[PDB]
Protein backbone atom coordinates (compact mmCIF):
# COMPACT_ATOMS: atom_id res chain seq x y z
CA UNK A 1 0.00 0.00 0.00
CA UNK A 2 1.23 3.60 -1.21
CA UNK A 3 1.49 6.54 1.43
CA UNK A 4 0.85 9.61 -0.22
CA UNK A 5 2.71 12.99 0.56
CA UNK A 6 1.15 16.72 -0.93
CA UNK A 7 2.73 19.61 -1.56
CA UNK A 8 2.59 22.96 0.83
CA UNK A 9 -0.43 25.45 1.42
CA UNK A 10 -0.57 27.94 -1.66
CA UNK A 11 -1.61 31.65 -2.50
CA UNK A 12 -2.22 32.15 -6.34
CA UNK A 13 -3.97 35.48 -7.78
CA UNK A 14 -7.06 34.94 -9.91
CA UNK A 15 -6.34 33.86 -13.56
CA UNK A 16 -3.21 32.27 -12.56
CA UNK A 17 -2.26 28.56 -12.63
CA UNK A 18 -1.37 26.11 -9.61
CA UNK A 19 0.59 22.68 -9.51
CA UNK A 20 0.34 20.77 -6.65
CA UNK A 21 2.52 17.84 -6.34
CA UNK A 22 2.05 14.62 -4.43
CA UNK A 23 4.61 12.13 -3.84
CA UNK A 24 3.67 8.01 -3.25
CA UNK A 25 5.89 5.62 -1.80
CA UNK A 26 5.50 2.02 -0.83
CA UNK A 27 3.53 -0.73 -3.45
CA UNK A 28 4.74 -0.80 -7.38
CA UNK A 29 3.65 3.00 -8.68
CA UNK A 30 2.56 1.78 -12.25
CA UNK A 31 -0.10 -0.71 -10.54
CA UNK A 32 -1.94 2.46 -9.35
CA UNK A 33 -4.43 4.96 -10.72
CA UNK A 34 -4.77 8.43 -9.15
CA UNK A 35 -7.51 10.69 -8.71
CA UNK A 36 -7.48 14.47 -7.16
CA UNK A 37 -10.36 15.29 -5.24
CA UNK A 38 -11.20 18.88 -4.32
CA UNK A 39 -13.25 20.46 -1.47
CA UNK A 40 -14.24 24.19 -1.28
CA UNK A 41 -14.49 25.31 2.58
CA UNK A 42 -17.53 23.49 4.07
CA UNK A 43 -18.32 22.10 1.02
CA UNK A 44 -18.27 18.65 -0.13
CA UNK A 45 -16.29 16.86 -2.54
CA UNK A 46 -15.62 17.70 -6.12
CA UNK A 47 -13.94 14.47 -7.70
CA UNK A 48 -11.62 16.43 -10.35
CA UNK A 49 -9.58 13.67 -13.03
CA UNK A 50 -7.95 10.71 -13.20
CA UNK A 51 -4.80 8.94 -14.35
CA UNK A 52 -4.33 5.26 -15.50
CA UNK A 53 -0.54 5.66 -14.66
CA UNK A 54 0.50 2.76 -16.52
CA UNK A 55 -0.77 4.32 -20.14
CA UNK A 56 -0.45 7.39 -18.67
CA UNK A 57 -4.05 8.53 -19.90
CA UNK A 58 -6.35 10.97 -17.45
CA UNK A 59 -9.78 11.77 -17.96
CA UNK A 60 -11.29 14.99 -15.94
CA UNK A 61 -14.83 16.44 -14.74
CA UNK A 62 -16.21 17.98 -17.59
CA UNK A 63 -16.70 21.63 -16.22
CA UNK A 64 -12.75 21.26 -15.28
CA UNK A 65 -12.22 19.73 -18.89
CA UNK A 66 -9.65 22.66 -20.60
CA UNK A 67 -8.02 24.03 -17.55
CA UNK A 68 -7.20 20.94 -15.50
CA UNK A 69 -3.90 18.38 -16.18
CA UNK A 70 -3.08 15.58 -14.05
CA UNK A 71 0.21 14.01 -14.62
CA UNK A 72 2.51 11.49 -12.92
CA UNK A 73 5.96 10.36 -13.61
CA UNK A 74 7.08 7.03 -12.96
CA UNK A 75 10.67 7.23 -12.29
CA UNK A 76 9.41 10.26 -9.41
CA UNK A 77 6.53 8.17 -8.53
CA UNK A 78 5.03 11.56 -8.32
CA UNK A 79 1.33 12.41 -9.42
CA UNK A 80 0.76 16.19 -10.48
CA UNK A 81 -2.35 18.76 -10.21
CA UNK A 82 -2.62 21.71 -12.94
CA UNK A 83 -5.16 23.94 -12.06
CA UNK A 84 -5.18 27.13 -15.07
CA UNK A 85 -7.24 30.46 -15.64
CA UNK A 86 -8.01 30.19 -10.89
CA UNK A 87 -11.01 31.76 -9.89
CA UNK A 88 -12.39 31.94 -6.23
CA UNK A 89 -14.34 29.38 -6.63
CA UNK A 90 -10.60 27.56 -6.86
CA UNK A 91 -10.64 28.34 -3.59
CA UNK A 92 -10.22 24.70 -1.54
CA UNK A 93 -8.36 22.14 -0.43
CA UNK A 94 -7.39 20.01 -2.78
CA UNK A 95 -6.57 15.84 -2.06
CA UNK A 96 -4.17 13.47 -3.85
CA UNK A 97 -5.69 9.76 -3.68
CA UNK A 98 -5.07 6.47 -5.51
CA UNK A 99 -6.23 2.91 -5.43
CA UNK A 100 -4.17 -0.50 -6.89
CA UNK A 101 -5.49 -1.62 -10.04
CA UNK A 102 -3.61 -4.96 -10.28
CA UNK A 103 -0.39 -6.33 -12.03
CA UNK A 104 -1.11 -3.99 -14.44
CA UNK A 105 2.55 -4.05 -15.61
CA UNK A 106 1.43 -7.78 -16.23
CA UNK A 107 -1.26 -7.26 -18.27
CA UNK A 108 -3.87 -6.72 -15.86
CA UNK A 109 -6.02 -4.05 -14.53
CA UNK A 110 -9.03 -3.75 -12.62
CA UNK A 111 -10.02 -0.24 -13.36
CA UNK A 112 -11.36 0.61 -9.38
CA UNK A 113 -12.73 3.70 -9.16
CA UNK A 114 -13.00 3.93 -5.42
CA UNK A 115 -9.94 5.81 -3.71
CA UNK A 116 -8.37 3.65 -0.65
CA UNK A 117 -5.34 5.70 -0.43
CA UNK A 118 -5.29 9.54 0.79
CA UNK A 119 -2.52 12.15 0.63
CA UNK A 120 -3.15 14.72 3.96
CA UNK A 121 -4.27 18.02 1.09
CA UNK A 122 -2.97 21.01 0.36
CA UNK A 123 -5.08 23.87 0.56
CA UNK A 124 -5.16 26.65 -2.22
CA UNK A 125 -6.51 29.85 -1.46
CA UNK A 126 -7.27 32.26 -4.86
CA UNK A 127 -6.70 36.04 -3.88
CA UNK A 128 -4.95 38.79 -4.94
CA UNK A 129 -4.21 39.92 -0.67
CA UNK A 130 -0.60 39.76 0.60
CA UNK A 131 0.69 37.06 2.58
CA UNK A 132 1.49 38.00 6.29
CA UNK A 133 2.44 36.36 8.91
CA UNK A 134 1.07 36.33 12.83
CA UNK A 135 1.75 37.41 16.07
CA UNK A 136 1.13 35.17 18.87
CA UNK A 137 -0.41 36.33 21.77
CA UNK A 138 -0.65 34.06 25.22
CA UNK A 139 -3.58 33.35 26.69
CA UNK A 140 -3.16 33.58 30.62
CA UNK A 141 -4.52 30.96 33.16
CA UNK A 142 -5.92 33.56 35.58
CA UNK A 143 -8.82 32.24 35.12
CA UNK A 144 -10.35 29.25 37.16
CA UNK A 145 -13.68 27.46 37.25
CA UNK A 146 -13.50 24.96 39.50
CA UNK A 147 -12.47 24.83 43.12
CA UNK A 148 -9.03 24.85 41.94
CA UNK A 149 -9.70 22.24 40.03
CA UNK A 150 -9.34 22.84 35.91
CA UNK A 151 -7.57 25.82 34.48
CA UNK A 152 -7.25 27.33 30.73
CA UNK A 153 -5.09 28.77 28.83
CA UNK A 154 -4.02 29.11 25.35
CA UNK A 155 -2.33 31.28 22.49
CA UNK A 156 -3.88 33.38 20.30
CA UNK A 157 -2.61 33.50 16.37
CA UNK A 158 -3.84 36.55 15.36
CA UNK A 159 -3.61 38.64 11.76
CA UNK A 160 -2.53 36.28 9.55
CA UNK A 161 -3.02 35.54 5.41
CA UNK A 162 -3.77 33.03 4.06
CA UNK A 163 -5.02 30.00 5.70
CA UNK A 164 -3.92 27.66 7.47
CA UNK A 165 -1.87 27.67 10.26
CA UNK A 166 -1.16 24.71 12.57
CA UNK A 167 -0.98 24.51 16.54
CA UNK A 168 0.24 22.08 18.95
CA UNK A 169 1.47 22.19 22.73
CA UNK A 170 4.74 21.54 24.01
CA UNK A 171 6.13 20.52 20.84
CA UNK A 172 3.12 17.39 20.92
CA UNK A 173 3.72 16.60 24.05
CA UNK A 174 0.07 18.27 25.13
CA UNK A 175 -2.46 16.68 23.62
CA UNK A 176 -4.94 15.90 26.02
CA UNK A 177 -8.14 18.34 26.39
CA UNK A 178 -6.43 21.08 23.37
CA UNK A 179 -9.11 22.74 21.70
CA UNK A 180 -8.22 24.74 18.49
CA UNK A 181 -10.30 26.53 16.85
CA UNK A 182 -11.43 26.86 13.39
CA UNK A 183 -9.50 30.18 12.19
CA UNK A 184 -11.87 33.16 11.65
CA UNK A 185 -11.58 35.99 8.83
CA UNK A 186 -11.72 39.42 10.72
CA UNK A 187 -12.94 42.99 10.03
CA UNK A 188 -9.86 43.77 8.46
CA UNK A 189 -10.02 40.81 6.26
CA UNK A 190 -7.20 39.16 8.31
CA UNK A 191 -7.75 35.77 10.28
CA UNK A 192 -7.39 34.81 13.52
CA UNK A 193 -7.75 31.85 15.80
CA UNK A 194 -7.48 30.97 19.33
CA UNK A 195 -5.66 27.62 20.61
CA UNK A 196 -6.76 26.71 24.21
CA UNK A 197 -6.38 23.66 26.61
CA UNK A 198 -7.73 22.81 30.10
CA UNK A 199 -4.75 21.61 32.83
CA UNK A 200 -4.91 20.69 36.02
CA UNK A 201 -4.64 24.03 37.89
CA UNK A 202 -2.74 23.00 40.21
CA UNK A 203 -0.10 22.24 37.80
CA UNK A 204 0.17 26.16 36.66
CA UNK A 205 3.56 26.80 38.77
CA UNK A 206 4.86 23.68 38.29
CA UNK A 207 4.14 22.64 34.58
CA UNK A 208 5.23 24.65 31.68
CA UNK A 209 3.47 25.63 28.81
CA UNK A 210 3.90 26.60 25.32
CA UNK A 211 2.40 25.99 22.32
CA UNK A 212 4.14 25.72 18.65
CA UNK A 213 2.77 27.89 15.97
CA UNK A 214 3.28 27.84 12.50
CA UNK A 215 2.31 29.72 9.70
CA UNK A 216 3.96 28.18 6.67
CA UNK A 217 2.99 30.01 3.71
CA UNK A 218 4.76 33.47 5.22
CA UNK A 219 7.54 31.48 7.39
CA UNK A 220 6.55 32.19 10.56
CA UNK A 221 7.35 29.76 12.71
CA UNK A 222 6.72 30.53 16.50
CA UNK A 223 6.88 29.11 20.36
CA UNK A 224 4.94 31.05 22.60
CA UNK A 225 4.75 30.01 26.43
CA UNK A 226 2.46 30.44 28.60
CA UNK A 227 2.62 32.08 31.90
CA UNK A 228 -0.41 32.18 34.39
CA UNK B 1 -23.63 14.13 -15.58
CA UNK B 2 -24.70 11.37 -13.41
CA UNK B 3 -26.11 13.31 -9.75
CA UNK B 4 -25.27 11.91 -6.86
CA UNK B 5 -28.23 13.16 -3.34
CA UNK B 6 -27.47 12.63 -0.40
CA UNK B 7 -30.48 13.77 2.44
CA UNK B 8 -30.53 14.72 4.76
CA UNK B 9 -27.37 16.62 4.74
CA UNK B 10 -27.47 16.51 8.28
CA UNK B 11 -28.64 14.01 10.79
CA UNK B 12 -28.59 13.49 15.02
CA UNK B 13 -28.59 10.39 16.45
CA UNK B 14 -27.95 8.82 19.96
CA UNK B 15 -24.67 7.04 21.24
CA UNK B 16 -24.47 3.67 20.86
CA UNK B 17 -28.11 3.82 18.19
CA UNK B 18 -27.90 2.95 14.87
CA UNK B 19 -27.63 5.98 11.96
CA UNK B 20 -28.71 5.08 8.56
CA UNK B 21 -27.91 7.64 6.08
CA UNK B 22 -28.97 7.82 2.80
CA UNK B 23 -27.55 8.26 -0.67
CA UNK B 24 -29.12 7.92 -4.44
CA UNK B 25 -28.39 8.38 -7.62
CA UNK B 26 -29.97 9.95 -10.57
CA UNK B 27 -29.36 6.88 -12.68
CA UNK B 28 -28.48 3.63 -12.31
CA UNK B 29 -24.98 2.66 -11.53
CA UNK B 30 -25.36 -0.51 -10.25
CA UNK B 31 -23.07 -1.41 -7.65
CA UNK B 32 -20.09 1.10 -8.59
CA UNK B 33 -21.09 2.91 -5.24
CA UNK B 34 -18.69 3.81 -2.34
CA UNK B 35 -18.63 5.12 0.72
CA UNK B 36 -16.25 7.67 2.62
CA UNK B 37 -16.20 8.69 6.27
CA UNK B 38 -14.31 12.28 6.49
CA UNK B 39 -13.51 13.75 9.71
CA UNK B 40 -12.70 17.23 11.09
CA UNK B 41 -9.08 18.61 9.56
CA UNK B 42 -8.92 14.75 8.05
CA UNK B 43 -8.97 13.20 4.38
CA UNK B 44 -11.50 10.85 3.49
CA UNK B 45 -11.32 7.65 4.43
CA UNK B 46 -12.79 4.98 2.35
CA UNK B 47 -15.18 2.30 4.12
CA UNK B 48 -17.56 0.57 1.64
CA UNK B 49 -16.81 -0.29 -2.46
CA UNK B 50 -18.73 -1.89 -4.34
CA UNK B 51 -21.89 -0.56 -2.56
CA UNK B 52 -21.94 -3.41 -0.15
CA UNK B 53 -18.01 -4.26 0.41
CA UNK B 54 -16.02 -3.65 3.63
CA UNK B 55 -12.53 -2.29 3.11
CA UNK B 56 -9.49 -2.97 4.88
CA UNK B 57 -9.42 -2.22 8.66
CA UNK B 58 -12.77 -1.24 8.97
CA UNK B 59 -15.12 -2.16 11.40
CA UNK B 60 -18.13 -4.32 11.03
CA UNK B 61 -20.88 -2.19 12.32
CA UNK B 62 -20.12 -0.01 8.89
CA UNK B 63 -22.42 -1.83 6.41
CA UNK B 64 -23.17 -0.90 2.22
CA UNK B 65 -26.43 -1.90 1.09
CA UNK B 66 -28.55 -0.85 -1.83
CA UNK B 67 -27.43 -1.09 -5.91
CA UNK B 68 -29.05 0.72 -9.16
CA UNK B 69 -30.28 3.87 -7.58
CA UNK B 70 -30.64 3.38 -3.97
CA UNK B 71 -28.04 2.88 -1.29
CA UNK B 72 -27.67 3.26 2.48
CA UNK B 73 -24.89 2.87 5.32
CA UNK B 74 -25.30 1.96 8.65
CA UNK B 75 -23.10 2.20 11.87
CA UNK B 76 -24.95 -0.13 14.23
CA UNK B 77 -23.75 1.34 17.49
CA UNK B 78 -22.47 4.75 17.20
CA UNK B 79 -20.04 5.76 19.13
CA UNK B 80 -18.49 9.28 19.55
CA UNK B 81 -15.52 8.77 17.43
CA UNK B 82 -17.95 8.26 14.50
CA UNK B 83 -18.81 11.82 14.31
CA UNK B 84 -17.96 13.16 10.51
CA UNK B 85 -19.27 14.13 7.26
CA UNK B 86 -20.06 10.23 5.61
CA UNK B 87 -20.09 10.74 1.62
CA UNK B 88 -20.83 8.09 -1.35
CA UNK B 89 -19.26 8.15 -4.40
CA UNK B 90 -20.14 6.16 -7.93
CA UNK B 91 -18.06 5.50 -10.67
CA UNK B 92 -20.03 3.10 -13.12
CA UNK B 93 -19.88 5.23 -16.06
CA UNK B 94 -17.12 5.74 -18.52
CA UNK B 95 -15.07 7.52 -19.63
CA UNK B 96 -14.50 7.57 -15.83
CA UNK B 97 -16.24 11.01 -15.04
CA UNK B 98 -16.93 9.60 -11.44
CA UNK B 99 -19.23 11.77 -8.51
CA UNK B 100 -20.15 12.67 -5.45
CA UNK B 101 -22.77 12.95 -3.48
CA UNK B 102 -22.97 16.61 -1.06
CA UNK B 103 -22.33 14.46 2.11
CA UNK B 104 -24.34 13.95 5.18
CA UNK B 105 -23.38 15.13 8.64
CA UNK B 106 -23.22 12.92 11.38
CA UNK B 107 -23.72 14.55 14.93
CA UNK B 108 -23.73 12.14 18.13
CA UNK B 109 -26.74 12.87 20.00
CA UNK B 110 -25.33 12.60 23.20
CA UNK B 111 -26.41 14.08 26.64
CA UNK B 112 -26.62 17.62 27.47
CA UNK B 113 -23.51 18.90 29.19
CA UNK B 114 -23.27 22.42 30.64
CA UNK B 115 -20.16 24.31 29.36
CA UNK B 116 -17.89 25.25 31.71
CA UNK B 117 -16.66 29.34 31.17
CA UNK B 118 -13.38 30.97 31.48
CA UNK B 119 -12.82 34.34 30.51
CA UNK B 120 -9.08 35.74 29.13
CA UNK B 121 -7.58 39.66 29.56
CA UNK B 122 -5.67 40.98 26.52
CA UNK B 123 -1.73 40.06 26.66
CA UNK B 124 0.16 43.60 27.76
CA UNK B 125 1.91 42.57 24.25
CA UNK B 126 -1.01 43.18 22.31
CA UNK B 127 -1.69 46.31 24.23
CA UNK B 128 1.30 47.23 22.71
CA UNK B 129 -0.01 46.69 19.21
CA UNK B 130 -2.85 49.76 20.25
CA UNK B 131 -5.59 46.75 20.28
CA UNK B 132 -7.32 44.76 22.81
CA UNK B 133 -8.74 40.93 22.55
CA UNK B 134 -10.65 39.97 25.31
CA UNK B 135 -11.31 35.91 24.79
CA UNK B 136 -13.89 33.96 26.48
CA UNK B 137 -14.56 30.35 26.50
CA UNK B 138 -16.94 28.16 26.77
CA UNK B 139 -15.73 24.44 27.17
CA UNK B 140 -17.41 20.73 26.95
CA UNK B 141 -20.75 21.45 26.40
CA UNK B 142 -23.76 19.68 24.21
CA UNK B 143 -25.81 20.60 22.32
CA UNK B 144 -24.23 23.25 20.47
CA UNK B 145 -26.64 26.25 20.92
CA UNK B 146 -24.94 28.72 23.15
CA UNK B 147 -25.29 32.27 23.76
CA UNK B 148 -22.47 34.82 24.57
CA UNK B 149 -23.12 38.32 26.27
CA UNK B 150 -20.40 40.48 26.54
CA UNK B 151 -20.94 43.85 29.30
CA UNK B 152 -18.08 46.38 29.50
CA UNK B 153 -19.76 48.08 32.58
CA UNK B 154 -22.87 46.30 32.44
CA UNK B 155 -22.74 48.02 29.26
CA UNK B 156 -24.03 45.04 26.79
CA UNK B 157 -21.97 45.23 23.91
CA UNK B 158 -22.62 44.04 20.09
CA UNK B 159 -21.41 43.60 16.35
CA UNK B 160 -18.03 44.00 18.48
CA UNK B 161 -17.35 40.01 19.10
CA UNK B 162 -16.45 37.10 16.80
CA UNK B 163 -17.11 33.16 18.16
CA UNK B 164 -15.71 29.98 16.70
CA UNK B 165 -16.95 26.93 17.42
CA UNK B 166 -14.69 23.35 17.28
CA UNK B 167 -16.46 20.70 15.88
CA UNK B 168 -18.05 17.73 17.97
CA UNK B 169 -15.28 16.54 19.77
CA UNK B 170 -14.28 12.52 18.93
CA UNK B 171 -14.11 11.58 22.48
CA UNK B 172 -16.66 13.20 24.30
CA UNK B 173 -18.98 14.51 21.85
CA UNK B 174 -19.14 18.10 23.52
CA UNK B 175 -18.70 21.61 21.71
CA UNK B 176 -15.98 24.64 22.47
CA UNK B 177 -16.92 27.84 21.50
CA UNK B 178 -14.43 30.85 21.69
CA UNK B 179 -15.93 34.61 21.36
CA UNK B 180 -13.77 37.17 21.33
CA UNK B 181 -14.12 40.79 21.66
CA UNK B 182 -12.10 43.14 20.09
CA UNK B 183 -11.56 47.15 20.91
CA UNK B 184 -9.18 49.84 20.21
CA UNK B 185 -6.60 49.95 23.13
CA UNK B 186 -7.77 53.44 23.54
CA UNK B 187 -11.40 52.20 24.49
CA UNK B 188 -9.84 49.38 26.20
CA UNK B 189 -8.32 51.58 28.90
CA UNK B 190 -11.50 53.64 29.63
CA UNK B 191 -13.28 50.75 31.06
CA UNK B 192 -13.17 48.49 34.03
CA UNK B 193 -15.32 45.98 33.88
CA UNK B 194 -15.54 43.09 31.29
CA UNK B 195 -17.53 39.86 31.64
CA UNK B 196 -18.68 37.02 29.66
CA UNK B 197 -22.60 36.22 30.57
CA UNK B 198 -23.03 32.59 29.05
CA UNK B 199 -26.85 30.79 28.50
CA UNK B 200 -26.92 27.17 27.85
CA UNK B 201 -29.80 24.73 28.70
CA UNK B 202 -26.96 22.40 30.78
CA UNK B 203 -27.18 26.26 32.88
CA UNK B 204 -29.73 26.50 35.41
CA UNK B 205 -29.17 30.02 35.19
CA UNK B 206 -26.55 32.30 33.18
CA UNK B 207 -23.30 32.33 34.25
CA UNK B 208 -20.94 34.86 33.82
CA UNK B 209 -16.90 35.23 33.92
CA UNK B 210 -15.04 38.52 34.18
CA UNK B 211 -11.82 40.49 35.37
CA UNK B 212 -11.19 43.94 36.17
CA UNK B 213 -8.70 46.13 33.73
CA UNK B 214 -5.81 45.66 35.71
Known amino acids: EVQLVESGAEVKKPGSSVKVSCKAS????????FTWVRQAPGQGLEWMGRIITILDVAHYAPHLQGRVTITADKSTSTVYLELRNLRSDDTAVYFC?????????????????????WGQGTLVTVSSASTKGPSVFPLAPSSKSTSGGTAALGCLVKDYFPEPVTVSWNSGALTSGVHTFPAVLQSSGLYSLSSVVTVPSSSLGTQTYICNVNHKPSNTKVDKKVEP | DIVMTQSPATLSVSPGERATLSCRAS??????LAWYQQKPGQAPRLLIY???TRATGVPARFSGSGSGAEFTLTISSLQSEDFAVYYCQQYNNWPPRYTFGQGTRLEIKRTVAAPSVFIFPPSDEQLKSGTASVVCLLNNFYPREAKVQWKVDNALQSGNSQESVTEQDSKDSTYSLSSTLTLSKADYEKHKVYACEVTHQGLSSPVTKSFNRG
Open chain 1, 26 to 33: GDTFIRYS
Open chain 1, 97 to 117: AGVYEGEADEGEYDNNGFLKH
Open chain 2, 50 to 52: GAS
Open chain 2, 27 to 32: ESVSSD
